[PDB]
Design an enzyme around this catalytic site. Sequence first.
Site, PDB file in Angstrom:
ATOM      1  N   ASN A  49     -79.310 -13.264 -64.899  1.00 32.02           N
ATOM      2  CA  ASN A  49     -78.007 -14.046 -64.580  1.00 32.02           C
ATOM      3  C   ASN A  49     -78.173 -15.230 -65.385  1.00 32.02           C
ATOM      4  O   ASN A  49     -79.227 -16.044 -65.449  1.00 32.02           O
ATOM      5  CB  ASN A  49     -77.994 -14.136 -62.974  1.00 32.02           C
ATOM      6  CG  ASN A  49     -78.614 -13.089 -62.429  1.00 32.02           C
ATOM      7  OD1 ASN A  49     -80.050 -12.867 -62.467  1.00 32.02           O
ATOM      8  ND2 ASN A  49     -77.894 -12.509 -61.333  1.00 32.02           N
TER       9      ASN A  49
ATOM     10  N   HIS B 288     -70.852 -12.502 -66.335  1.00 32.55           N
ATOM     11  CA  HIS B 288     -71.933 -12.986 -67.164  1.00 32.55           C
ATOM     12  C   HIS B 288     -71.767 -13.060 -68.684  1.00 32.55           C
ATOM     13  O   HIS B 288     -72.477 -13.236 -69.661  1.00 32.55           O
ATOM     14  CB  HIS B 288     -73.281 -12.248 -66.810  1.00 32.55           C
ATOM     15  CG  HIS B 288     -73.888 -12.355 -65.644  1.00 32.55           C
ATOM     16  ND1 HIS B 288     -74.924 -11.630 -65.257  1.00 32.55           N
ATOM     17  CD2 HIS B 288     -73.473 -13.060 -64.484  1.00 32.55           C
ATOM     18  CE1 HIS B 288     -75.364 -11.851 -63.920  1.00 32.55           C
ATOM     19  NE2 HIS B 288     -74.424 -12.903 -63.511  1.00 32.55           N
TER      20      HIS B 288
ATOM     21  N   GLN C  96     -81.744  -6.243 -59.424  1.00 26.91           N
ATOM     22  CA  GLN C  96     -81.460  -6.760 -58.071  1.00 26.91           C
ATOM     23  C   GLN C  96     -81.465  -5.580 -57.039  1.00 26.91           C
ATOM     24  O   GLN C  96     -80.693  -4.846 -57.338  1.00 26.91           O
ATOM     25  CB  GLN C  96     -80.307  -7.636 -58.061  1.00 26.91           C
ATOM     26  CG  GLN C  96     -80.510  -9.106 -58.914  1.00 26.91           C
ATOM     27  CD  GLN C  96     -79.454  -9.958 -58.902  1.00 26.91           C
ATOM     28  OE1 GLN C  96     -79.486 -10.851 -59.638  1.00 26.91           O
ATOM     29  NE2 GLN C  96     -78.306  -9.709 -58.045  1.00 26.91           N
TER      30      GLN C  96
ATOM     31  N   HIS D 240     -80.927  -5.530 -53.297  1.00 23.83           N
ATOM     32  CA  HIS D 240     -80.697  -6.392 -52.360  1.00 23.83           C
ATOM     33  C   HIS D 240     -79.495  -6.045 -51.627  1.00 23.83           C
ATOM     34  O   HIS D 240     -79.239  -4.845 -51.482  1.00 23.83           O
ATOM     35  CB  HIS D 240     -80.715  -7.867 -53.213  1.00 23.83           C
ATOM     36  CG  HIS D 240     -79.301  -7.794 -54.074  1.00 23.83           C
ATOM     37  ND1 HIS D 240     -78.555  -8.696 -54.369  1.00 23.83           N
ATOM     38  CD2 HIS D 240     -78.611  -6.699 -55.019  1.00 23.83           C
ATOM     39  CE1 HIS D 240     -77.525  -8.412 -55.130  1.00 23.83           C
ATOM     40  NE2 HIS D 240     -77.844  -7.200 -55.435  1.00 23.83           N
TER      41      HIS D 240
HETATM   42  C1  LIG Z   1     -69.065 -13.667 -56.923  1.00 22.44           C
HETATM   43  C2  LIG Z   1     -70.115 -14.095 -57.948  1.00 22.44           C
HETATM   44  C3  LIG Z   1     -71.351 -13.969 -58.264  1.00 22.44           C
HETATM   45  C4  LIG Z   1     -72.116 -14.454 -59.233  1.00 22.44           C
HETATM   46  N1  LIG Z   1     -73.698 -14.560 -58.883  1.00 22.44           N
HETATM   47  C5  LIG Z   1     -74.292 -15.221 -59.770  1.00 22.44           C
HETATM   48  C6  LIG Z   1     -75.767 -15.345 -59.616  1.00 22.44           C
HETATM   49  O1  LIG Z   1     -76.365 -14.698 -58.681  1.00 22.44           O
HETATM   50  N2  LIG Z   1     -76.487 -15.907 -60.944  1.00 22.44           N
HETATM   51  C7  LIG Z   1     -75.758 -16.780 -61.774  1.00 22.44           C
HETATM   52  O2  LIG Z   1     -76.521 -16.856 -62.671  1.00 22.44           O
HETATM   53  N3  LIG Z   1     -74.535 -16.449 -61.863  1.00 22.44           N
HETATM   54  C8  LIG Z   1     -73.627 -15.845 -60.917  1.00 22.44           C
HETATM   55  N4  LIG Z   1     -72.308 -15.994 -60.967  1.00 22.44           N
HETATM   56  C9  LIG Z   1     -71.711 -16.589 -61.962  1.00 22.44           C
HETATM   57  C10 LIG Z   1     -71.851 -18.300 -61.858  1.00 22.44           C
HETATM   58  O3  LIG Z   1     -71.159 -18.597 -60.813  1.00 22.44           O
HETATM   59  C11 LIG Z   1     -71.375 -18.913 -63.339  1.00 22.44           C
HETATM   60  O4  LIG Z   1     -71.917 -18.682 -64.400  1.00 22.44           O
HETATM   61  C12 LIG Z   1     -71.489 -20.506 -63.061  1.00 22.44           C
HETATM   62  O5  LIG Z   1     -70.403 -20.907 -61.966  1.00 22.44           O
HETATM   63  C13 LIG Z   1     -70.527 -21.084 -64.362  1.00 22.44           C
HETATM   64  O6  LIG Z   1     -70.596 -22.412 -64.292  1.00 22.44           O
HETATM   65  P1  LIG Z   1     -69.888 -23.507 -65.113  1.00 22.44           P
HETATM   66  O7  LIG Z   1     -69.966 -24.907 -64.313  1.00 22.44           O
HETATM   67  O8  LIG Z   1     -69.714 -23.322 -66.538  1.00 22.44           O
HETATM   68  O9  LIG Z   1     -68.412 -22.653 -64.812  1.00 22.44           O
HETATM   69  P2  LIG Z   1     -67.442 -22.563 -63.442  1.00 22.44           P
HETATM   70  O10 LIG Z   1     -68.054 -22.309 -62.220  1.00 22.44           O
HETATM   71  O11 LIG Z   1     -66.465 -21.242 -63.988  1.00 22.44           O
HETATM   72  O12 LIG Z   1     -66.507 -23.748 -63.245  1.00 22.44           O
HETATM   73  C14 LIG Z   1     -65.594 -24.244 -64.189  1.00 22.44           C
HETATM   74  C15 LIG Z   1     -64.360 -25.131 -63.749  1.00 22.44           C
HETATM   75  O13 LIG Z   1     -63.743 -25.709 -64.434  1.00 22.44           O
HETATM   76  C16 LIG Z   1     -62.451 -25.489 -64.011  1.00 22.44           C
HETATM   77  N5  LIG Z   1     -61.131 -25.620 -64.980  1.00 22.44           N
HETATM   78  C17 LIG Z   1     -61.116 -24.476 -65.559  1.00 22.44           C
HETATM   79  N6  LIG Z   1     -60.395 -24.690 -66.591  1.00 22.44           N
HETATM   80  C18 LIG Z   1     -59.972 -26.036 -66.469  1.00 22.44           C
HETATM   81  C19 LIG Z   1     -58.976 -26.730 -67.140  1.00 22.44           C
HETATM   82  N7  LIG Z   1     -58.189 -26.475 -68.296  1.00 22.44           N
HETATM   83  N8  LIG Z   1     -58.852 -28.041 -66.889  1.00 22.44           N
HETATM   84  C20 LIG Z   1     -59.588 -28.566 -65.806  1.00 22.44           C
HETATM   85  N9  LIG Z   1     -60.562 -27.730 -65.327  1.00 22.44           N
HETATM   86  C21 LIG Z   1     -60.411 -26.510 -65.677  1.00 22.44           C
HETATM   87  C22 LIG Z   1     -62.463 -24.535 -62.949  1.00 22.44           C
HETATM   88  O14 LIG Z   1     -61.472 -24.680 -62.017  1.00 22.44           O
HETATM   89  C23 LIG Z   1     -63.740 -24.677 -62.554  1.00 22.44           C
HETATM   90  O15 LIG Z   1     -64.103 -25.346 -61.549  1.00 22.44           O
HETATM   91  C24 LIG Z   1     -71.666 -15.397 -60.114  1.00 22.44           C
HETATM   92  C25 LIG Z   1     -70.225 -15.652 -59.939  1.00 22.44           C
HETATM   93  C26 LIG Z   1     -69.335 -15.131 -58.932  1.00 22.44           C
HETATM   94  C27 LIG Z   1     -67.909 -15.344 -58.702  1.00 22.44           C
HETATM   95  O1  LIG Z   2     -70.249  -8.878 -59.566  1.00 20.65           O
HETATM   96  C1  LIG Z   2     -70.588 -10.521 -59.842  1.00 20.65           C
HETATM   97  C2  LIG Z   2     -72.073 -10.251 -60.065  1.00 20.65           C
HETATM   98  O2  LIG Z   2     -72.752 -11.644 -60.305  1.00 20.65           O
HETATM   99  C3  LIG Z   2     -74.051 -11.541 -60.561  1.00 20.65           C
HETATM  100  O3  LIG Z   2     -74.741 -12.686 -61.220  1.00 20.65           O
HETATM  101  C4  LIG Z   2     -74.864 -11.366 -59.330  1.00 20.65           C
HETATM  102  F1  LIG Z   2     -76.248 -11.332 -59.429  1.00 20.65           F
HETATM  103  C5  LIG Z   2     -74.288  -9.798 -58.897  1.00 20.65           C
HETATM  104  O4  LIG Z   2     -75.005  -9.516 -57.815  1.00 20.65           O
HETATM  105  C6  LIG Z   2     -72.953  -9.793 -58.681  1.00 20.65           C
HETATM  106  O5  LIG Z   2     -72.676 -10.586 -57.705  1.00 20.65           O
END
Ligand SMILES: Cc1cc2nc3c(=O)[nH]c(=O)nc-3n(C[C@H](O)[C@H](O)[C@H](O)COP(=O)(O)OP(=O)(O)OC[C@H]3O[C@@H](n4cnc5c(N)ncnc54)[C@H](O)[C@@H]3O)c2cc1C
Ligand SMILES: OC[C@H]1O[C@@H](O)[C@H](F)[C@@H](O)[C@H]1O
Lengths: 573, 576, 90, 90
Positions: free
Chosen positions: A548, A503, A403, A405
């Site tokens: 990602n 990740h 990336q 960016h």
């Molecule tokens: C800063 C940042 C940048 C990122 N950028 C990217 C990117 O560009 N691309 C990408 O592919 N990924 C990225 N990610 C990762 C991506 O956000 C996650 O892979 C994705 O949100 C996972 O989705 P999910 O629904 O499995 O889990 P989560 O989004 O982690 O949500 C799971 C949830 O369940 C909840 N929970 C946890 N435990 C319990 C429990 N015991 N009881 C009830 N609820 C519970 C939480 O409160 C939460 O809402 C990034 C993450 C961050 C923070």
């Molecule tokens: O450090 C968390 C990372 O998550 C990844 O998925 C993003 F693409 C990165 O740029 C960075 O934000």
Amino acid sequence: KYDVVIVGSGPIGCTYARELVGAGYKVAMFDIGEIDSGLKIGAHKKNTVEYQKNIDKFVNVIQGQLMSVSVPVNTLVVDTLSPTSWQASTFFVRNGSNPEQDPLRNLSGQAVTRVVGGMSTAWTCATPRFDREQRPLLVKDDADADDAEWDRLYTKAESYFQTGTDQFKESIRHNLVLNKLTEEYKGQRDFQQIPLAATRRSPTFVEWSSANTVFDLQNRPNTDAPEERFNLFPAVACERVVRNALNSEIESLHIHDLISGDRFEIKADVYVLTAGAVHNTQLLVNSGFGQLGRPNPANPPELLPSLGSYITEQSLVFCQTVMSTELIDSVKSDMTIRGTPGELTYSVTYTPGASTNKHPDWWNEKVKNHMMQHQEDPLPIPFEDPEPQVTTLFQPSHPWHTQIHRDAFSYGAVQQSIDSRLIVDWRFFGRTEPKEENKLWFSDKITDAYNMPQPTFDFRFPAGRTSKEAEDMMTDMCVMSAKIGGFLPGSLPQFMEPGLVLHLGGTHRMGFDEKEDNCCVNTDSRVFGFKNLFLGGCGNIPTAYGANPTLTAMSLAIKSCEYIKQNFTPSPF
Amino acid sequence: MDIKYDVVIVGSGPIGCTYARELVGAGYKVAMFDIGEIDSGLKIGAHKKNTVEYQKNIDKFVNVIQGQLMSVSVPVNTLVVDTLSPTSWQASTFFVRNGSNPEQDPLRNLSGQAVTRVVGGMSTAWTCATPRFDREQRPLLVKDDADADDAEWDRLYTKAESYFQTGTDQFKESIRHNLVLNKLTEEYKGQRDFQQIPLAATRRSPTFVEWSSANTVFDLQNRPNTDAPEERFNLFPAVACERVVRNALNSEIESLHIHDLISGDRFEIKADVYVLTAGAVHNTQLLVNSGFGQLGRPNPANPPELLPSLGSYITEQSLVFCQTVMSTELIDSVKSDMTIRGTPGELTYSVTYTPGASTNKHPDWWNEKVKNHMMQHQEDPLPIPFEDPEPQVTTLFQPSHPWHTQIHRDAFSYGAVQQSIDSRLIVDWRFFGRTEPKEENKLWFSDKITDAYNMPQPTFDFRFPAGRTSKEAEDMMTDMCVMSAKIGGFLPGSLPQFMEPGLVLHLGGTHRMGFDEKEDNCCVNTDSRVFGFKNLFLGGCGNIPTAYGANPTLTAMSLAIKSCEYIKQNFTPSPF
Amino acid sequence: FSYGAVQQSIDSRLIVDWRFFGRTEPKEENKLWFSDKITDAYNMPQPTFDFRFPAGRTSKEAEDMMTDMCVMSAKIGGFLPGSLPQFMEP
Amino acid sequence: NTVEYQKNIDKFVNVIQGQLMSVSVPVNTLVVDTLSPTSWQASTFFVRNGSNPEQDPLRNLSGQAVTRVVGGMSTAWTCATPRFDREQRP
Ligand SMILES: Cc1cc2nc3c(=O)[nH]c(=O)nc-3n(C[C@H](O)[C@H](O)[C@H](O)COP(=O)(O)OP(=O)(O)OC[C@H]3O[C@@H](n4cnc5c(N)ncnc54)[C@H](O)[C@@H]3O)c2cc1C
Ligand SMILES: OC[C@H]1O[C@@H](O)[C@H](F)[C@@H](O)[C@H]1O
Ligand SMILES: Cc1cc2nc3c(=O)[nH]c(=O)nc-3n(C[C@H](O)[C@H](O)[C@H](O)COP(=O)(O)OP(=O)(O)OC[C@H]3O[C@@H](n4cnc5c(N)ncnc54)[C@H](O)[C@@H]3O)c2cc1C
Ligand SMILES: Cc1cc2nc3c(=O)[nH]c(=O)nc-3n(C[C@H](O)[C@H](O)[C@H](O)COP(=O)(O)OP(=O)(O)OC[C@H]3O[C@@H](n4cnc5c(N)ncnc54)[C@H](O)[C@@H]3O)c2cc1C
Ligand SMILES: OC[C@H]1O[C@@H](O)[C@H](F)[C@@H](O)[C@H]1O
């Protein structure tokens, strides 16, 4: 009593919601966190005018919500306390630290978010597809059928997230970097816009997608969806799924309402766990799957012996660069500049449409206007020009995602000395071989802030290919970035803290055969042996991947919902 | 969006919300505009600290605060970066970059001054400390009758306290609170009084406090609604208010010019009554962008037509800070009443005490908690329970110690969170000095540089006045050193220091109140009405014209209640 | 002659320094001159520099040099945190 | 060349730093705004502490330093003595 219960309101639980609420099931979703993205429930918190005018501040929002998974006992020596101050004689368990955690075999950067919408309230929105090398098999022995199936799921996942590759197409910084890298690697690598889950609303505002984009999270029935049934319950900690004696069905979900203090057993036909890669595993282990406590090979688990083994976390290298003088001069390559800036005599003009112009009319027009309205400024790039968003995707000859960016998740203090228009972030992401020794386990003694078993990592990047590629990846970043400019002092090329990348995969991995594929779910994301228990998220992904992972976990959740629709009938409305 | 209202309020902070609570309640068709957006959950404009997750991880909340505080005036950066690659584009001069302000002298700034643009304003993240000002700190509302002046302020303060849900007993059963309170009470016996910080907050459980906010004052829900079917209120977020349009005669406001940030559309909103509650910086900016005061670098050689005191006599408090690590003496005194059998973790460990024993140093509620902690956690070397709330102690401003004091734990930490010293042992110390109002201390606005919303760039010209303000500031530092030493030594990394000017965010006097525009060098009268204008009112800390040490919001709210009384008597609501 | 705080966590047997040194084209405009008003600690005319690395070959080589150091060093090991690849103060 | 320095080679950096005197140090424009109100404080970034007001901070050799000791810099130097090839040599 519900048809389907979903634990977690991240983008993956929202995928289950959108599919299953859509097909007419009575759905309840529980989340341990609360609503705080405003009136659009679970929406991206960066979608304020204020944050997009002040983007360097958004890193604070991300840091606020990211709670470290496992912090080892602190052994920093503080020996300048006053002699009157109380002091311990040992490095005792203080401040939430985890005495189970070896500080040298940790993912110190791994962290979890507890808010409605999950991590999609804060994410960067990069949603690339995996290519075959990174991607698990959904059909064996038929690669065209496997490809067809992934293309169908990914296309669907992309419509849910509103994934596109056009949102930064008129940025000068974006095109400046894209074209330089295209030219320099002509016929060796291809570059394009990072596919991003986002819709541009205006030249200076992008509506970043989120869980809310997938499913709005409003209770149903409502005016817009009067035949649908959905209830979201925030501030509810889900703690255990209750197994029958034969380990063939889940009988209920035990919850704790954090506001009332009450505890309940909720009944559903179908139980979906989408609590993230760390918390899905926790819940499962607290329910008598895998093994509680420090790994003990002598005491082999009743159920899911692969649970929390074969964990993968990507290597991440990062730097920032300051744009070369040559590239900055090229921005104004088509311009005729006469007189001296700040005087009535000064003029900047170009020939519109000339096929010898290096840049299109829209670029030249923006440069011209900038140079003419801001004659005190030494740079040709407009002040509100959007950031670069460039990638060359993973290929066998460069097996890392890239990336190129500007990320709102900066990693050191934001410097102010170098003009922001000059600065480009580089993040290259490596793939990690799944190895049985790399584990996420849960203490039988230490508990976390919600009285659940404390997560503990035992992790190192595997020797061999993983490590060889990681260092090759670093070199590649150094080599590639130099085509754009020198490293920004304070953001020199470095490996980031293990897990800061977020990740994490493979904690409850998918495969065809539980034993032969050392896995926990099948390709319907169904827990082996159990009729009615499904896991969703990056923890399903069993391969070494660099890109990602979210779009891919979403695709798998789409396929899982297909099985659910074929095997469980919705209750009458 | 209607174009016509009874009352329009710019800003949805606690002061705008006071005007809304008073005038919506009284039957006026009210619109409220905020440049910022709704983010704090289902409760519009509520405290962001009121989540289970933040109160289990309170050390993370400093991120939330930092995320929404945008610096007001950053001077041109002159750091030398001389290790760029020779191929990188390199500056020849320290040119204007990254939103910096070339008007700003870096040595006469309030560099820590910052502003928040979100619905609920700064009350979405504040510390909730709401003390009253004593006479010395407080502007007069009645001339030549001190007892009537005091009675009027008591009446106003009592109402403001009920609006904010201010209390002084939310931490009465904290061991750490009482340990600190009792030691300081004893050490200054007959010299100074100590109490709980009056706090805008309701305790909901032993581990959760519902901190108050704008939302507490007024819930910001559109009306009419089921709970208020005869009231009329609309809130319009993401609306930048840019100008109030003066009539040619300079006797009335004719419209409010707004810019909807989402649609891009601009409108002229009509109201009978216009109330500006955009904060001490932004109220002044909006006034200056509308023709009040003087736009540009101050220039005596042409005084302004209207409000010549606008943006002068500005006050900001000196703030000193440190943290301490609790003395061995005080920590041992926590368990003074305990009988302890044998050795911890070993079979015949018991900890017991005698409820009501006259020789007990502490009350039964304290001993019961300590006992239970020492018995449930025998590995832990401290006697303070893990969930014991933080101290919240003050000795309020007096003539012999003319500074406000907070001996507490603030979510707003100033440096990186340290992890080595057990958090139970750490106490914060903040002492707050009063600043004499001086004409030379100014907030003005550039006639060329603009900010992120294209409004005139705020610029400070400020120094702490020589004489009493400075003498008191240094005396206050010494006081903090001497007082803090009675509780513990300094925590390394948080040694006694002055904070960046304006980080305290108690800026006053930018549009100051008085009786007579000319004799008192002011902008609004004691009804908060702008002189010469029938229908223009300012609310907030910018009104306060005195040298105060204590936290100002309660006092600003009290002024706003007075102002509503005037409005209710002088304007009639439209029929419903 | 180490350049930053010397670190103690990584065994010094493992540590190798890399210094690559670029050649700079001589340019009339690159000057060392002496003040006619300001004096140094021994009352002699105070030295003043007027110096930038010349554009063209000198700068192109310096950046290529940096790249070569990242490429070559990786053959022996990864960067030590706190001594990452950087241009030193002119 | 002492037994003590070659047993404690990490300490020799301080010798070198103790005898390297910076050639031209620009006037300091660091903002220190947390002084007590009672302390004497600057209205301008005046010439302090041996700084050179002739020096453009952005066209300097800030790392250039001199040594005033018998034996000059060869009292502290690294002792790398390569030959120049024709390309580098007058
Ligand atoms: C800063 C940042 C940048 C990122 N950028 C990217 C990117 O560009 N691309 C990408 O592919 N990924 C990225 N990610 C990762 C991506 O956000 C996650 O892979 C994705 O949100 C996972 O989705 P999910 O629904 O499995 O889990 P989560 O989004 O982690 O949500 C799971 C949830 O369940 C909840 N929970 C946890 N435990 C319990 C429990 N015991 N009881 C009830 N609820 C519970 C939480 O409160 C939460 O809402 C990034 C993450 C961050 C923070
Ligand atoms: O450090 C968390 C990372 O998550 C990844 O998925 C993003 F693409 C990165 O740029 C960075 O934000
Ligand atoms: C971390 C922190 C801790 C604090 N601690 C306390 C303490 O404990 N006690 C004490 O008394 N106070 C303290 N304060 C200060 C307190 O928060 C403020 O004094 C108080 O919020 C002022 O309220 P107000 O309604 O005048 O303005 P603000 O809360 O600043 O709200 C003004 C608003 O108007 C808006 N706005 C601004 N310009 C425009 C425009 N042009 N058009 C439309 N809308 C506009 C904003 O978005 C904003 O919502 C603290 C502040 C901070 C940030
Ligand atoms: C830490 C360090 C590492 C180095 N490593 C290397 C290395 O590996 N390789 C190498 O080739 N180079 C190295 N150098 C550079 C090398 O030291 C110099 O190039 C060399 O010493 C220059 O020799 P010189 O006799 O010309 O001048 P210097 O050694 O500078 O000696 C000049 C002298 O003249 C004096 N003097 C100055 N002004 C006056 C005056 N007005 N009147 C009377 N006396 C005066 C001094 O006090 C001094 O003794 C290193 C330098 C140092 C400090
Ligand atoms: O620095 C901002 C300050 O605001 C003040 O009002 C609070 F009382 C302090 O504790 C601090 O939070």
